[PDB]
Design an enzyme around this catalytic site. Structure first.
Site, PDB file in Angstrom:
ATOM      1  CD  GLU A 289      -3.010   1.307   2.551  1.00 37.04           C
ATOM      2  OE1 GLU A 289      -2.750   0.328   3.251  1.00 37.04           O
ATOM      3  OE2 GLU A 289      -4.015   1.989   1.967  1.00 37.04           O
TER       4      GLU A 289
ATOM      5  CE  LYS B  43      -8.397  -3.295   7.501  1.00 38.46           C
ATOM      6  NZ  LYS B  43      -8.897  -1.897   6.857  1.00 38.46           N
TER       7      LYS B  43
ATOM      8  CG  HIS C  36      -9.152  -6.972   8.208  1.00 39.53           C
ATOM      9  ND1 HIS C  36     -10.066  -6.703   7.461  1.00 39.53           N
ATOM     10  CD2 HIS C  36      -8.317  -7.466   7.635  1.00 39.53           C
ATOM     11  CE1 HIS C  36      -9.993  -6.727   6.398  1.00 39.53           C
ATOM     12  NE2 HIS C  36      -8.988  -7.265   6.332  1.00 39.53           N
TER      13      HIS C  36
ATOM     14  CG  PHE D 295      -7.213 -11.192   1.791  1.00 38.94           C
ATOM     15  CD1 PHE D 295      -8.012 -10.954   3.059  1.00 38.94           C
ATOM     16  CD2 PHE D 295      -5.829 -11.262   2.231  1.00 38.94           C
ATOM     17  CE1 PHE D 295      -7.251 -10.782   4.311  1.00 38.94           C
ATOM     18  CE2 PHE D 295      -5.301 -11.163   3.385  1.00 38.94           C
ATOM     19  CZ  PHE D 295      -5.773 -10.631   4.402  1.00 38.94           C
TER      20      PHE D 295
END
Ligand SMILES: [Cl-]
Ligand SMILES: [Cl-]
Ligand code: NA
Ligand code: NA
Lengths: 414, 414
Positions: free
Chosen positions: A320, A338, A343, A402
Site C-alpha cells: 500500500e 485497523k 479488520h 484479499f
C-alpha cells in the site's frame, strides 16, 4: 470527459452514517473513543480459543452485540448478517430523520465478505435428522449471500435496485462505489450502502492464521495491530458493520438534510497477481486511487488525507505504501484505523468510509495506534501520538482486499 | 441524456460466448439441440434422491461434468464454482482467438447464487479432527463467494476490476450489466462476464421444494418444466455455467473480432415486496426492462423478442407477464429457455443472455417446450411447436430473481 468537478456527474453527498464497532454501538462514540486513543482489541474470552489452543488469542468483539437487540422471531428467521443489516438499517434511517423518499429512486448496496454462512451449515443438520420436509421453508431467504441487502431493501422500501458486491476486504467500499455509480448514471437519487460481516469465530481465525496473516501478540492485545510500524506482525480481527446514506445534493437540499461530506468518485481495479497476496509494486492499487481522482476531477496534490487499508501485515502495508506513491498521494496525512478497530473483512471498508467522512467533517485525524517505529521501506506521513487537527479538503479511503480487489473512494469536505 | 443510440455511450459488442449445460458442453451444440426440441431434464439417478425420498426426482445434470476436465491438483485447491470458472474462462478465451489485450483495460464480472458453499462446510471438519493447524492454508481462497471471478481474473490477467454480484437467479445477468457499466463509464474496454453455479444437490432441492416452487412431474421429466403453460407446477433445476466476452466495437474492430450481437443497455431494479415472491403487479420488473431501453435508446416498439425469466412457477410467470405488459413489450415473441434447460440460479441469466445473442445472430427462436395450453391470465406470444424464424432486430433478456432482484439486458443484432 464527465467528472464531479466539471458537473458531468451530479453532486452526491453523505447525509447520515451508522456503525457498530468493538469500541461502541454509537458511531459518534466510536469517533470520540478513536480520538481519545482507545482500542477495541482485547483478549478473546471465547471458549473456542482454549478449546483449539489457537495461536491468535486476541480480537475485538462488538461492544454491543447485535443479538442483544434481537427477539426470538428475528433470531430464528434471519442470518446474523441479516440481523445486523436490519439493526443498522433502522438506526441509519432514524438518524436521517426517517425521510419519505421515492421508492423508485432509492437503491440499497450492501457488501459482505463471508456472508450468511452459518445458516447453510445449519440447514444440513435437521435434514440429516428429520429429512427434507424438516427444512425450514424460510431456509432459502436465510442462506444466500445477498440476504442482508435484501432485508434492508425490504425494510426501507428500496425499488431502484438491491445489490450485493463480494470482494473480500473491499466489499463494503465497493458497495459504496456501486451506489455512487447507480446515482451518477441516473438510476437512483438516494442509496443506503455499506457492509456487514459476521462475528469472530474459530474457523476464520484458523484460516487466516495459517497464512501467517494475523498478529499473535497475545500478551498486549491493544498493542498488537501496528499498521506501517516496523514491528508489525499481521492483522487483528475487530467486528463491525457500517452503513451510510448518500443522495444527490439536490435531493438532500429538497428535504432539509445537512450533508456530512461529498462522495466525489470511486475507482475499482484488480491486481490479477495472486489469490491472496497483494502485488508488491502497488501499481494497480494506486491506479484505483488515480481513477477515483479522475472521476472526482481532482489531482493528487488535492488529496490531504488517505484513510489507509493498513491491515498491519508485512507485505500488505508495504504494497500500500507503493500504491500511495504510485498515485502521487504520499504527501497526504495517513490514518490506519485497523490499528484501533481491527479488520472486519466485508464491513471494514464501509466503516473506514464513515471514518473518512467524519475526518473531513471535523477536520481531525485520530492517531494511528502503536505506530512507534517508522518502517524505512514505508516513508509515509502517518498520524500518530494524538489526533492531528488539519485543513483536510479532500481524502481517499483505500480498501485493498484479499485477491487483489482494489477500491478507492474519493471524498470531499462539504 | 446519454444513450447507446445517440452515441453518449460507446458501442459495446459481444464477441465470444461459452456455456456448459444439461444438453451439451458445447454452446453451439446446445443451440442446435434447443432448436431440435431437446430437453436436458431427466430422472435424477443420484443416491440422495432415494436416500431422502425427495418429492422432486428430476433435473438436468451437466451433459459433460466439469470435473471430468479437472486433475487432482485442481480438485484439491479450488471450489466447484472455481473449477467451473477456470474451465469456462479458458474455453471462452480460446473461442475469442486468445487475444492479447491490455490488462489494465480488461475486467471480469462473474456472478453466483450459492457460491463455494461446499468448502466452507468442509473446513469445519478436519479442524474438528486435527485442530486449527490442520486447516488447509489454501482454505481462504476456496471459501469466499468471489472465488470464481478471482480465479478467472487471475487466469486471464484482468486488471481493470474483478467483481462478483450476488442476486440469486439474476446474478449472471447482473454480472453482464455491471461489466457493461464498467465499459461505458470508461473503466475498461473489454470484459469477461457471466455466471457460475454448483451442481444439483439435496439441500437446494429440499429448500426450494419446501416453498412449493418446484415441479414434481417425476413420471415425465422432459414435460415437467412448463413456463407460461396453464398446467405448470414450478421450476426444474438444470445445471449450467456461462460466460461471454464483451468489448467496445472499436476494440473488436482493431483486433479483427467478428461481433455476434450488440449489448445496448441494462436495467437493475428491485421489488422491495417479499423475501422470495415476486410482486404480482410486475411493475418494478417491467421498469428494469424500460430502463434497459432508455439506456439503449430504444422504444418498446423496437423490441421483437423477449427471452423470459420464465421459471414455470405459477406466481412467477404471472408476475412476468404483467411486467412485459408494463414495459410495453407484450407484442414481442417470447421464449422461455428454462422449459428445456431448467433453472441454474446464479448462472442462468448469463446462459439466457448467450441464448439471446444467438437468437439475434441466427434470426431464430427455439420452441418453448411443453407450452401446450395458453394460460388465460398470460396473454403472451410464446414461441412453441418448432423454432420461429424471424427478423429479430432487438431483444430483452429478463432475469427476475428470488428476493425481487430485477435485471433486464437489451441486445441488438450486429
Ligand atoms: Cl501526527
Ligand atoms: Cl411459434
Ligand atoms: Na481505509
Ligand atoms: Na431470460
Amino acid at each position: 470527459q464527465p467528472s464531479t468537478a466539471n458537473g458531468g456527474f451530479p453532486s452526491v453527498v453523505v447525509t447520515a452514517v451508522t456503525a457498530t464497532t468493538s469500541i461502541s454501538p454509537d458511531i459518534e462514540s466510536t469517533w470520540k473513543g478513536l480520538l481519545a486513543g482507545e482500542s477495541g482489541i482485547h483478549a478473546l474470552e471465547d471458549e473456542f480459543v482454549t478449546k483449539w489452543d489457537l495461536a491468535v488469542k486476541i480480537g475485538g468483539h462488538l461492544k454491543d452485540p447485535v443479538d442483544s437487540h434481537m427477539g426470538r422471531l428475528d433470531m430464528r428467521r434471519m442470518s446474523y448478517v441479516q440481523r445486523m443489516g436490519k439493526l443498522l438499517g433502522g438506526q441509519l434511517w432514524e438518524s436521517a430523520g426517517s425521510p419519505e423518499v421515492d421508492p423508485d429512486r432509492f437503491a440499497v448496496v450492501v457488501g459482505t465478505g463471508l456472508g450468511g454462512a452459518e445458516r447453510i451449515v445449519e440447514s444440513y443438520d435437521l435434514m440429516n435428522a428429520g429429512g427434507p420436509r424438516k427444512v425450514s421453508p424460510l431456509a432459502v431467504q436465510m442462506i444466500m449471500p445477498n440476504g442482508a441487502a435484501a432485508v434492508i431493501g425490504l425494510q426501507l422500501g428500496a425499488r431502484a435496485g438491491v445489490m450485493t458486491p463480494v470482494s473480500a476486504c473491499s466489499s463494503g467500499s465497493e458497495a459504496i462505489a456501486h451506489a455512487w455509480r447507480q446515482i451518477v448514471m441516473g438510476d437512483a437519487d438516494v442509496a443506503v450502502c455499506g457492509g456487514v460481516e459476521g462475528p469472530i469465530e474459530a474457523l476464520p481465525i484458523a484460516a487466516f492464521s495459517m497464512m501467517r496473516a494475523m498478529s499473535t501478540r497475545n500478551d498486549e492485545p491493544e498493542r498488537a495491530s501496528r499498521p506501517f510500524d516496523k514491528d508489525r506482525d499481521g492483522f487483528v480481527f475487530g467486528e463491525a458493520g457500517a452503513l451510510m446514506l448518500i443522495e444527490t445534493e439536490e435531493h438532500a437540499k429538497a428535504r432539509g438534510a445537512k450533508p456530512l461530506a461529498r462522495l466525489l468518485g470511486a475507482g475499482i481495479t484488480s491486481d490479477a497477481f495472486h489469490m491472496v497476496a497483494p502485488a508488491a509494486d502497488g501499481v494497480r492499487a494506486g491506479r484505483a486511487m488515480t481513477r477515483s481522482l479522475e472521476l472526482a476531477g481532482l489531482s493528487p496534490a488535492d488529496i490531504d488525507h488517505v484513510n489507509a487499508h493498513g491491515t498491519a501485515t508485512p507485505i500488505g502495508d508495504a504494497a500500500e505504501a507503493n500504491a500511495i506513491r504510485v498515485a502521487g498521494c504520499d504527501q497526504a496525512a495517513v490514518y490506519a484505523p485497523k490499528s484501533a478497530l481491527g479488520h472486519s473483512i466485508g464491513a471494514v471498508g464501509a466503516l473506514e468510509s464513515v471514518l473518512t467522512v467524519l475526518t473531513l467533517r471535523d477536520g481531525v485525524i485520530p492517531p494511528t495506534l502503536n505506530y512507534e517505529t517508522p518502517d524505512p521501506e514505508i516513508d509515509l506521513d502517518v498520524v500518530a501520538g494524538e489526533p492531528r487537527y488539519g485543513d483536510y479538503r479532500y481524502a481517499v479511503n483505500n480498501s485493498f482486499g484479499f485477491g487483489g480487489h482494489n477500491v478507492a473512494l474519493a471524498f470531499g469536505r462539504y
